[PDB]
Symmetry: D2
Amino acid sequence: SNRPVALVSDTRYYVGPDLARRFAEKGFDLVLGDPSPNLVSELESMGARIVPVTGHSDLSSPESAQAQADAALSAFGRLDSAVMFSGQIVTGRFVNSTIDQLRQVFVGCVEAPYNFMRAVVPVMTEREAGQILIITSASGARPTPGAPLYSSVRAAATMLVKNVADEVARTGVQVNAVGTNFMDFPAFLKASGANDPEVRAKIESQVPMRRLGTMEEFSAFCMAFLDGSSRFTTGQFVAYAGGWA
Amino acid sequence: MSNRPVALVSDTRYYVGPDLARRFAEKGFDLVLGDPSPNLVSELESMGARIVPVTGHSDLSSPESAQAQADAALSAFGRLDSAVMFSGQIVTGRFVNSTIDQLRQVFVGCVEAPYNFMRAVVPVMTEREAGQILIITSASGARPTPGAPLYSSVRAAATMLVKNVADEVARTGVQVNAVGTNFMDFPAFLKASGANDPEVRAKIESQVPMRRLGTMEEFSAFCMAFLDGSSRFTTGQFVAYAGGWA
Amino acid sequence: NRPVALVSDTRYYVGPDLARRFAEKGFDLVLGDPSPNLVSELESMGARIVPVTGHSDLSSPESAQAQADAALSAFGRLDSAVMFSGQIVTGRFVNSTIDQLRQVFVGCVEAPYNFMRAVVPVMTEREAGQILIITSASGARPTPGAPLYSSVRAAATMLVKNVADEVARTGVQVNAVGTNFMDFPAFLKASGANDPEVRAKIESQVPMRRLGTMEEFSAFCMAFLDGSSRFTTGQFVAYAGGWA
Amino acid sequence: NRPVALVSDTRYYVGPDLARRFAEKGFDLVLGDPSPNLVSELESMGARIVPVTGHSDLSSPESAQAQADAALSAFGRLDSAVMFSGQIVTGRFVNSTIDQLRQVFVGCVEAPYNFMRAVVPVMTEREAGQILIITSASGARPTPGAPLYSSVRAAATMLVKNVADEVARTGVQVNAVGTNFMDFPAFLKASGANDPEVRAKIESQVPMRRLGTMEEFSAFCMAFLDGSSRFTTGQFVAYAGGWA
């Protein structure tokens, strides 16, 4: 393939569709987790060749991650950029929590990015080139009122990224993390009660920047670690949360 | 309710456990100890401490084990002023040679154990509107750790859990703080690292910024700043204890 | 109406590259001391250029105010503002002097203070704007051989975090980035990396085993300046091949 | 012989309580500007006292050197050394001045620089010693209403971490601790917390919902100074009821 190839692990939700659009704008070919037919059509009109991978977007197994990485090599014979997000918010006071909740949040927030990096890193170290962005959470960077177990496991995910980054830095492969809070997408609006307009104003009051962030603006930020234009930073965590972190 | 303050040391079988118990006895505490030797019980009794041994719960492998240690304190003394634990085993190896089952195993050791300890002890202390908890995590949690990427990752979860619990319960007067070591002189570290060989040991000491290994005795004295009741206005702290390595 | 960027200094380091990225993104430019070659290049890229001479060191409240006032006079607006300052000071703490601490404070803290003191009020008035203060990766960690430089760079980064938190409600973003091990003349001199033997020793100790380029650093900086991403403030990101 | 502790200032804040903790721990004392009442009290606890007059602001290298020389002259050793410095400066960044930035730098950074520049070389030649620089919890995070203060406190903490890393191979430890929300007169005055309702509003900002005492803070500081613990250096610990 003459064009660079990006893997977006999940295009069903959150920033996934917008990441694919940014990559198509940057002249990438794409391997996408479970893209809608419409998203595939849109990206193809932007001049991007698209290879959908179905059923492995939860990265719930080493096999799921390997299938996504293998799809890039099978289709295009290269993999230049790879990005994933995972996990669901778990809320409730520590003193009312259970060991089972901690185990469940660990799976989505740590096993998933573990599996992704275990599959993708060897592909890129072999090429002595590549950019990996692991989207964790801003909740990993600070104590998070009402989400103590969630915050704890997100911190492990971010530190895993920093550890992997340091281990492979000499190969030229970059591994970075970003993490959000107070973003405007369905799963958050439902969990936060933001869907009511009056409630959304209350949620905004918590945010220093007094608003929710967009998938569009977050996807543009993510390109700083994925579009190939900037290659001399690794092991970073950046919060994307309106100044909350 | 007993007049002397009571400390729980979750495990006196290894590492800093015996030394923590000695420091507490010197500070006029009574003690609940995980799996103490008869030698250690006799030593602390000679120092004027009442000792309640708890057998077989020191791995904190379930909520029930953490609850058994907390309940031993309330049964014997009707109070629990200070509580400290350490857990986990170093796991090393390149990230690309690691397994998901290793990640799960280090999570159990490094995060489930302190989760179980805090889940049992915090409610006891918040009811009393007082108490000091020290969770010994690891210095490897505070920075990327060459050769131990998974271990470092899960240690960081444990330290961030402490900070979250601390912030949640701070208004109750209960303090929850963490400390983490590297390069300490105890058998499990010496066995790992290859320290038992002197040449490996001397080379290892060469790499530490302070150019030596730490002692259990000096580390136990440090830990008292978060446990002996003399200082009560900090919570949610992590302090490294690793000869300047972190 | 095209957005307006201020690049405080286009004489050295990433300044000329920042101006080029901004021109590529459809910005008009207020620049500190641009060369006629750079002005010609940026004008050929279709950008209107307002040169400001003599204030590129930001050594006074007046210098920073002059650059901000220039934007308002030419364009009536200021959408993005970026600065770098300071000189590497090296040597063991035990051999250092209070005068060296005072000098490195002026370059590394007074200059960004002056820049934000002038630019922030302009942007908070319009309830919009992006500020990037380039501090140093030395501010994020102990820096062997540059202890005083490291200390004052930490102040600059923490000032940015303080200003960011103060003005977040206005929508103005204030972020910091900081380099080490960058391929520019000034750095090679301070590191003695001009000698290839020292150079290889310098590349070693850099996890990505190389020096960074002005071009790739300028691209990274656009994430805080090009208007495409507006929902983060008070960040510090290191740009140092993994060293921080 | 007895270990020797330098407490740079016993006039205010935690100074007198640090002197009391050191005397309890069996130290002889070199003290900045102690009252005769405090000298007598510490004498009664079995400590030998060397008062140093007029050097407690650490306003020059010479004043820090005078304190260090007082220890060696009297006792021929200096095992532990602790200082605090600086005064709160409050106000919005956009209403601040460069002069305010310069003044807070002197108190919060030049003072600890001067202390370490004198004390470190004394201890490194003895291949032992414990230094505690009290900076501020405001150095560890954005501090609403004190942006300039927060920024310079961050420099002081980072200077400590840099000095620690440079001298760690000598066995000398250099650590920092930083408070907020402590019950002492200067804070009650600045805060208006002499009024109980003002004090309740201040305490509401503190996770632990109270102010800290000089006595309990002095006990904490002994972990870095009393000689019982010697295997950590380059740490910053906040002492601010969970606020940092």
